[PDB]
């Protein structure tokens, strides 16, 4: 199995999982410790945002790749904004802060 691009889930925009659906492989928890254990930071940033979750960045990435520009704009993943609202849907005011 292999996936360039295709479906994304509705609640959070991460890719579907499967062969019965054209899914992307889970870069699961242990793999992230494995990247962190190399120095590899940019790989990780990509793997869990641009390749994955950032609804802007992935379409800007795709176009930069067809243009062959080899550059990314990383943003902030929409699954994390899901978390904020799911906490803020408790009476817990969590918020992003500036300084």
């Amino acid at each position: 199995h292999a996936r360039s691009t295709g479906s994304y889930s509705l609640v959070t925009q991460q890719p579907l999982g499967g062969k019965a659906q054209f899914g992307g492989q889970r870069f699961g928890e242990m793999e992230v410790w494995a990247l962190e254990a190399y120095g590899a930071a940019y790989t990780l940033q990509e793997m869990l945002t641009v390749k994955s979750d950032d609804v802007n960045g992935r379409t800007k990435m795709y176009k930069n790749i067809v243009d062959g520009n080899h550059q990314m704009e990383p943003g902030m993943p929409e699954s994390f904004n899901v978390l904020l609202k799911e906490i803020r849907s408790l009476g817990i005011n969590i918020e992003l802060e500036d300084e």
Binding site: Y42, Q45, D54, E97
Partner: protein
């Protein structure tokens, strides 16, 4: 026969408080001294004891007055780092000088340590069935072992210090890997210990603004101390205290990284009534919000960002 000396469990205070004794004697009323010693050769019998040497026996130097007759694979590392106290915690002595009995065994025994100088009245409740390595007359230190059984790191840290608990944990974990043939460099265990004992407990707040007793991250008190010492005001003093990792993580100073581990509804409410604030130093928080980790290549960027400052 050899006589059975009575157990404190088999006989009353009229036997307990009558604690059995075997002083060596002469019509001089005292023994020939060791130079600089006042102590007579008074000696004593514990419970269970077997005694052949009744009254009027001539005793030599070296004679036995009496005799007293008497773990795992992976869990024995998991419960090591979590620093769980064992079932059978060896009673370790404290401060210094010399032991004594306190008051005898009913409900339990109570026994005492009394120094060369200072606070004589330190006393401790002690279990009966762990046979004692000392009786009444024995010179003792913080960290001398009063029973057998395995140690407990909380106390080792209290009694032989951080270096001694590192040396303990590194040995007693590698004794698992060396047994099963595995190799690991020792430094990768110290790096967990380094984290196990990141917290500290305030004994003197001194001139510092911590609560009159508080638990604090050790770096936070240390950085307050260094500048207050440069101001020459009385710095705070503390004990470092050894949390097991399953707790020393929830005690991280930064709720996102703790809350995303376990006990979420604890951390995410305890932090919420405190109104707590997170600066996103460290790795796991930066992964959650999906930015460069402050490590490796991303450390070098965070460093340049922080240097051009």
């Amino acid at each position: 026969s050899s006589l059975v000396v009575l157990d404190s469990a088999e006989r009353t205070a009229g036997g307990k408080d009558l604690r059995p004794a075997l002083k060596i004697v002469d019509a001089q009323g005292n023994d020939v001294l060791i130079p600089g010693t006042d102590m007579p050769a008074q000696y004593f019998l514990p419970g269970k004891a077997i005694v052949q040497l009744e009254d009027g026996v001539q005793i030599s130097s070296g004679d036995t007055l009496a005799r007293i007759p008497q773990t795992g694979g992976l869990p024995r590392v998991a419960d090591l780092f979590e620093a769980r106290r064992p079932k059978e915690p060896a009673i370790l002595a404290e401060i210094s000088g010399i032991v004594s009995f306190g008051k005898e065994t009913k409900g339990k025994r109570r026994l005492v340590i009394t120094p060369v100088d200072g606070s004589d009245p330190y006393e401790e409740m002690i279990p009966k069935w762990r046979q004692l390595n000392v009786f009444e007359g024995e010179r003792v230190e913080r960290g001398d072992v009063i029973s057998d059984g395995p140690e407990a790191p909380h106390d080792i840290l209290r009694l032989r210090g951080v270096h001694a608990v590192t040396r303990y944990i590194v040995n007693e974990v590698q004794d698992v890997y060396r047994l099963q043939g595995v190799k690991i460099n020792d430094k990768h265990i110290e790096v967990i210990v380094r984290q196990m004992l990141r917290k500290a407990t305030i004994v003197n707040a001194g001139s510092s603004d911590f609560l009159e007793g508080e638990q604090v991250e050790y770096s936070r008190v240390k950085i307050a101390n260094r500048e207050l010492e440069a101001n020459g005001k009385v710095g705070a003093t503390y004990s470092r205290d050894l949390l097991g990792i399953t707790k020393a993580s929830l005690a991280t100073e930064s709720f996102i990284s703790a809350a995303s581990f376990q006990e979420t509804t604890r951390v995410l409410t305890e932090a919420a009534v405190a109104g707590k604030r997170d600066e996103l130093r460290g790795l796991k928080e930066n992964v959650i919000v999906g930015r460069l980790i402050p490590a490796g290549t991303g450390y070098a960027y965070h460093q340049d960002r922080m240097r051009r400052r």
